[PDB]
Amino acid sequence: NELNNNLP
Amino acid sequence: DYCKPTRLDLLLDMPPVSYDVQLLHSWNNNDRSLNVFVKEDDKLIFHRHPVAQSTDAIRGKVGYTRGLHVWQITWAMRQRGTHAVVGVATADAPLHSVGYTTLVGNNHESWGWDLGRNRLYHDGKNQPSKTYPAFLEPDETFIVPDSFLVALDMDDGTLSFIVDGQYMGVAFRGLKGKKLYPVVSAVWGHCEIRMRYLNGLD
């Protein structure tokens, strides 16, 4: 659930 | 009192090119961000790795210098994220930024349509964006469908788009005497974007 579907 | 075809109309009326020709005009797997890749199982498609705080672009294999050229972009609405931009670029345009940005259009080397914002960017550090299609009111937006067409006329020096079968008007002018590649910039993890070249005239 990151803004642009990316891995932290 | 009768119907005349545009060169664009005539191009769209010819049968689209073979797969071989589509592949020759497809995404260049050796001219891309390190954070994207062309899919081996479908070479018309590139896929973006889920990299946080990163904007990533990729150029088509062919930089157009003359003629009219039309390709289809398929980009599922749900895989667009905050910054989904489609356009053209020179060979010198940057294919990556830190952060989420309108990478295509943020410099002198690229010209882009931001699909979410319905706005055009070129030399963004120094020049204002423009509403596109231009009939839209300041605060009026529509969702660009999954597939649509991009039309680059290197003889007129113009870039235009076709959406839902309708001509959206000229987006960018002033493109004569350049060498311009298809381009997109993306920020969405695992987003896939297809470019299918349709045809060219000249």
Residue numbers in the entry:
A (entry chain B): 1 to 8
B (entry chain A): 30 to 231
According to the publication:
The SPRY domain- and SOCS box-containing proteins, SPSB1 to SPSB4 (also known as SSB-1 to -4), contain a protein interaction domain known as the SPRY domain, which was first identified as a sequence repeat in the dual-specificity kinase splA and ryanodine receptors, together with a C-terminal SOCS box motif. The presence of the SOCS box motif suggests that the SPSB proteins may function as part of an E3 ubiquitin ligase, with the SPRY domain determining the substrate(s) for ubiquitination, and this has been confirmed recently for SPSB2 (Z.K., R.S.L., R.S.N., and S.E.N., personal communication). All three hSPSB proteins share the same conserved SPRY domain fold with two short N-terminal helices packed against a bent β-sandwich, comprising two 7-stranded β-sheets. The structures show remarkable conservation of the SPRY domain fold and absolute sequence conservation for positions in contact with the (E/D)(L/I)NNN motif.
The structure of hSPSB1 bound to hPar-4(67–81) was refined to 1.79 Å resolution, enabling direct comparison of the hPar-4 and VASA binding modes in hSPSB1. Residues Asn67-Pro74 from hPar-4 were well defined, corresponding to the minimal binding motif determined by NMR chemical shift changes. Further electron density was not present to build the C-terminal residues (75–81, GGAPAAP), suggesting that, as for VASA, the N-terminal site is sufficient for high-affinity interaction. The hPar-4 and VASA peptides adopt similar conformations, with tight superimposition of the conserved NNN motifs, which form a total of six conserved hydrogen bonds, including two between hPar-4 Asn70 and hSPSB1 Thr111 (side and main chain), one between Asn71 and the Gly218 carbonyl, and three from Asn72 to Arg77, Tyr129, and the Val216 carbonyl. One further conserved main chain–main chain hydrogen bond is formed between Asn70 of hPar-4 and the Gly218 amide of hSPSB1. However, the longer Glu68 side chain of hPar-4 reorients the backbone to replace this bond with the somewhat unfavorable 3.3-Å juxtaposition of the Glu68 β-carbon with the hPar-4 Asn72 carbonyl. At the N-terminus, the hPar-4 residue Asn67 makes no contact with hSPSB1. To the C-terminus of the NNN motif, the introduction of a proline residue (Pro74) also induces a main-chain shift; in VASA, the preceding residue, Asn189, makes both main-chain amide and carbonyl hydrogen bonds to the hSPSB1 backbone, but in hPar-4, only the amide bond can form. Neither Leu73 nor Pro74 in hPar-4 makes a significant contribution to binding.
